[PDB]
Structure formats: C-alpha cells, structure tokens
UniProtKB/Swiss-Prot annotation, chain A:
Site of covalent link Glycyl lysine isopeptide (Lys-Gly) (interchain with G-Cter in SUMO2): K218
Name of the gene encoding the protein in the UniProt record: MCM4
Chain sites annotated for binding ATP 2: N42
The protein's assembly and partners: Component of the MCM2-7 complex. The complex forms a toroidal hexameric ring with the proposed subunit order MCM2-MCM6-MCM4-MCM7-MCM3-MCM5. Component of the CMG helicase complex, a hexameric ring of related MCM2-7 subunits stabilized by CDC45 and the tetrameric GINS complex. Interacts with MCMBP.
Motif (Arginine finger) on chain: 62-65
Name of this chain's protein: DNA replication licensing factor MCM4
Residues annotated with N6-acetyllysine modification: K278
Subcellular location: Nucleus; Chromosome
Disease: Immunodeficiency 54: An autosomal recessive disorder characterized by severe intra- and extrauterine growth retardation, microcephaly, decreased numbers of natural killer cells, and recurrent viral infections, most often affecting the respiratory tract and leading to respiratory failure. Affected individuals also have adrenal insufficiency requiring corticosteroid replacement therapy and may have an increased susceptibility to cancer.
Misc. remarks from the entry: Early fractionation of eukaryotic MCM proteins yielded a variety of dimeric, trimeric and tetrameric complexes with unclear biological significance. Specifically a MCM467 subcomplex is shown to have in vitro helicase activity which is inhibited by the MCM2 subunit. The MCM2-7 hexamer is the proposed physiological active complex.
Residues of the full protein shown: 577 to 863 of 863
Annotated family: Belongs to the MCM family.
Source organism per UniProt: Homo sapiens
From Swiss-Prot, chain B:
Gene responsible for this protein: MCM2
Record's protein name: DNA replication licensing factor MCM2
Homology family: Belongs to the MCM family.
Biological role: Acts as a component of the MCM2-7 complex (MCM complex) which is the replicative helicase essential for 'once per cell cycle' DNA replication initiation and elongation in eukaryotic cells. Core component of CDC45-MCM-GINS (CMG) helicase, the molecular machine that unwinds template DNA during replication, and around which the replisome is built.
Modification(s) after translation: Phosphorylation by the CDC7-DBF4 complex during G1/S phase is required for the initiation of DNA replication.
N6-acetyllysine PTM sites in chain numbering: K44
Disease field: Deafness, autosomal dominant, 70: A form of non-syndromic sensorineural hearing loss. Sensorineural deafness results from damage to the neural receptors of the inner ear, the nerve pathways to the brain, or the area of the brain that receives sound information. DFNA70 is characterized by slowly progressive, postlingual hearing impairment.
C-alpha cells in the first residue's frame, strides 16, 4: 500500500507489458519480466469499500485476478476455535509435524510434476459455461442500464479454470473448473466490490475508485454551487469563504473544503468560473 | 615530368632537389597568374589587403588550386608537412617582390588551406589516416591559456573538441579529441564555440596508456592548419 509513485509506474509497466525497459549511462535495453505478483496491503472501516479505504489507484487494483479481505469476525466460536488451535500449536509435536512435512514434500512433487507436463485445453462445455458467465455479468449491469463486464474479467475466469483443471491433472478444462471459477470470482466480487452503502456490487468502484454515490453527490454539489453563483450573478467576483458558508448553510451534508474545491474545479473545467485565490470569478 | 612516381615514396620523392624546385616554381607561378571569372587577378588584391593591415597570414582555396594545378593538389593531402613548407618559402618572396620593405614587419608568412573536400566524422578516425591532412567538426569544451613554446619562442595553446550535441544518437555518449594551436591561431576560439578544424593527424608513445591497457598502444592529436566557425 505505501510504495511510491515511480514504483507504481514501473509495476504498471511490468504487469501490462511483461517486460522492463532501461535507458541509463549509455546502457539501452529491454528485459523479460514475466512474473506472478502476490501482494499484501493495508489501510478497518466497513462504511467504505477496499479501494475507497486503501491508498492505491484503480489502474493497479483492476489487474488482480482475485482480491481478498482479512478482518476479525467478532464471533465467540471463532475466538474459541482460534485460541484452541493456538493451544494445540503450543503443544505442537513431531507426531504430526513429520506428517505435515511429508505432505509438503509430496505437494512440492505434485506441483512440479503437474507444471512439467500438463496443458489444459478447451471443451465445448467449458466454452459454453464461460460464455454464459460473461453474459451473466453483462446482464447484471443491464438493470442499471450500464456496463458490468469486459474481456479482462473473462480472462480471469479462463485462467482460474485452467489452473483448476491442472490441479485435477486433466488435459481438458471442463465445466467442473468453470463452475468453481465462477464461485471464486463471484465470492471475490462480493467481498471486494460491494458498495457498503447499498449491499450491491458496483463495478465503478473497481474501474474508477469510488461508489456511484460519491459521483452523484459531487455532481449535485456542483449544480448547487452553480445555482448559488447564478443567484448572485449580478456580481462578477464572489468570495471563497462566503460561497463555502452559503453552501454549508443550505446543505444537509457537512460539506468539506475538498468537496467544495472539487466542485469549483469541475465548474472551471466546464468553463463556468475561474478561481483566483480567495475570489471566484464568472466566465 | 613531376608526376613520374618511380622507386620512391612520395615523401622521399618531394625531398629530391628536382621535384622540390618544380613544386616551388609551380606554386609561385600559380600565385602570380591565377584569375577570377571576370579576368581579375585574385591574389594581387588578397596580398595587398594582407600587407595593408600587417596580418602575416595567407589563405588559399583547395578547389581552384586543384582546378589549375591538380598535380600539387594530388600530393598535398599525402605529404602535408613537406608541401606546406615549400609553399611558405614560395609565398614570402612574392610578397617581397610586391612590397620590398615588408621584411621590416615580419620574416615569415604562413599559408593556410581551406574548403578541403574529404571531411570525416570525429568518431570515424582510424589508423588508416595517420600523418595525413583531414577535416572535422565539433564543440570546444576545454581550452588552456596561451603559453610560450621553444623553437626563439612562439605562442602555443591546447584544446579539446567533442561531437556536437544532437549529432550523437539518443541516450548514448560522445567521442572527443585534442588539438594544438600555434602562432596566429591562438584565441581563434573559446569554450562552447562550434568550429570547423583542418589539420594533420599525428600520434606518439605514452607509458600511461601501455601500463593501463597492457598492450603497446599509442596516443594521438591533431595539428591545426586552418580554423573557421560553421
């Protein structure tokens, strides 16, 4: 979560292009950098979705095939089981450590063997199921008259289905893999992309960094600000603090300095006003 | 006939008395007889301007030297330190023939060549070019003070030139060379200037290079003969 902008930029380049470019001190070259990323991040606040809480932009967060959230459940039985597992670990002994070690060695061999020879390829059933999954995600947006699927989502489902097929050591990817891929993808969408303001998955969170609620509030604030300036339109210049007090005196929401300035910037990009220090001027 | 190169290198040939005298007479006659397209004598005017201002330095153009006396133009880049010596000796007596009192002002006159056709890039010099007359371009970065050098004493100055920025490829590094300025060439330039340099390519031994590389490798420098801004 707390890497700097240049690191974010080179990471974006690597994850999009799978190569890294260098030009320094007479050295000019291109390198192969096809690597699998696994990241751990931090801000909890249930009133806001993950991308709304953490620092990083949607350009990077939209690249992961799956996203997971880890927090305490406030469950007595969960604490009891966790403490019991901890007590069992306090008495951890060779009677089961050796068995876990043996299974770990066998698992390394299993992964190495599967990786060395197995190539899952498409089936008619898997193709139908994957097409249907994409159609389901497009249909989910149709009630709101909006986009809710695009090809990158289908790639995530395909990769997960191929991996599940390879776990079974199957040379065919098949409906067994796709239904599990849909399950994981749906669960991940539920946990990662739900708007806590409505309990519904809002794709614009993952593609723009905010709930559509924030967008609507910003637009309404800009229209209210425009109406306030127009109601005083006999004057060419209005004071910043006076406009802030007018808005905050007419709003139900406790509008912040950032919200007010974002609305001013939006109206400036719309060629309605110019902000000159402490004075707002009409165009 | 002067052209009869047999049994000798050109350096040895122009050292011989017969060829030396033929070269001397041919350049002198070229100076007195050369005419412009209008039928005007070129060097009467140029010598008179040189004398009136006490400047002691004569510029010649390679193109019309070739156009009228090609045999000398053919030898000139192959043995510059020989033909330039003969040329200096020939020019001084033409000057004294026109202006008999000019030995009061100076006892030597230097001939400087210009518009030499065989330009080379500052990184394309090779051992193929050693002890020949060349032309290159670049920007000055280092420039010593003017100092006196033994010979009698004469002015001496040393400079460093490198490839003009934006003529190197993007993101890579420039090459560079050292050059030597003697007599009336000093203070013909200052740092940051872009110049056109005509000179002799020359090399000598240096123990530092041999000990740094481990192979018997020599150092090189350019003796300037004509300098002009582009």
């Amino acid at each position: 979560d707390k890497m700097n902008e240049s690191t974010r930029s080179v990471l974006h380049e690597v994850m999009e292009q799978q190569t890294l470019s260098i030009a320094k001190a007479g050295i000019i070259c291109q390198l192969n950098a096809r690597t699998s990323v696994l990241a751990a991040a931090n801000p909890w606040n249930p009133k806001k979705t993950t991308i709304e809480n953490i620092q990083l932009p949607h350009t990077l967060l939209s690249r992961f095939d799956l996203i997971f959230l880890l927090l305490d459940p406030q469950d007595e039985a969960y604490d009891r089981r966790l403490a019991h597992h901890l007590v069992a670990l306090y008495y951890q002994s060779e009677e089961q450590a050796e068995e876990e070690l043996l299974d770990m060695a066998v698992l390394k061999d299993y992964i190495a063997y599967a990786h060395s020879t197995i190539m899952p390829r498409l089936s008619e059933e898997a193709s139908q199921a994957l097409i249907e999954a994409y159609v389901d995600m497009r249909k989910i947006g149709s009630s709101r008259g909006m986009v809710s699927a695009y090809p990158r989502q289908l790639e995530s489902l395909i990769r997960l289905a191929e991996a599940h097929a390879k776990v079974r050591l199957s040379n065919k990817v098949e409906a067994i893999d796709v239904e599990e891929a849909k399950r994981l993808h749906r669960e991940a969408l539920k946990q990662s992309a739900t708007d806590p303001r409505t309990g519904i998955v809002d794709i614009s969170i993952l593609t723009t960094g905010m709930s559509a609620t924030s967008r609507k509030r910003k637009e309404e604030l800009a229209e209210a600000l425009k109406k306030l300036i127009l109601s005083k339109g006999k004057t060419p210049a209005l004071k910043y603090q006076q406009l802030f007090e007018d808005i905050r005196g007419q709003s139900d929401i406790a509008i912040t300095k950032d919200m007010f300035e974002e609305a001013l910037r939006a109206l400036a990009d719309d060629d309605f006003l110019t902000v000159t220090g402490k004075t707002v001027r009409l165009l | 006939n002067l052209e009869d190169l047999k049994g000798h290198s050109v350096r040895e040939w122009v050292s011989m008395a017969g060829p030396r005298l033929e070269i001397h007479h041919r350049f002198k006659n070229f100076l007195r007889t050369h005419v412009d397209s209008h039928g005007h004598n070129v060097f009467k005017e140029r010598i008179s301007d040189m004398c009136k201002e006490n400047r002691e330095s004569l510029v010649v153009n390679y193109e019309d030297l070739a156009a009228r006396e090609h045999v000398l133009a053919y030898f000139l880049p192959e043995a510059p330190a020989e033909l330039l010596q003969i040329f200096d000796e020939a020019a001084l007596e033409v000057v004294l023939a026109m202006y008999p009192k000019y030995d009061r002002i100076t006892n030597h006159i230097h001939v400087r060549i210009s518009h030499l056709p065989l330009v080379e890039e500052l990184r394309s010099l090779r051992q193929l070019h050693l002890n020949q007359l060349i032309r290159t371009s670049g920007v000055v970065t280092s420039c010593t003070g003017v100092l006196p050098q033994l010979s009698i004493y004469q002015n001496y100055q040393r400079i460093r030139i490198q490839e003009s920025p934006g003529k190197v490829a993007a993101g890579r590094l420039p090459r560079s060379k050292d050059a030597i300025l003697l007599a009336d060439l000093v203070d013909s330039c200052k740092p940051g200037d872009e110049i056109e340099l005509t000179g002799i390519y020359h090399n000598n031994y240096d123990g530092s290079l041999n000990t740094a590389n481990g192979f018997p490798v020599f150092a090189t420098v350019i003796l300037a003969n004509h300098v002009a801004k582009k």
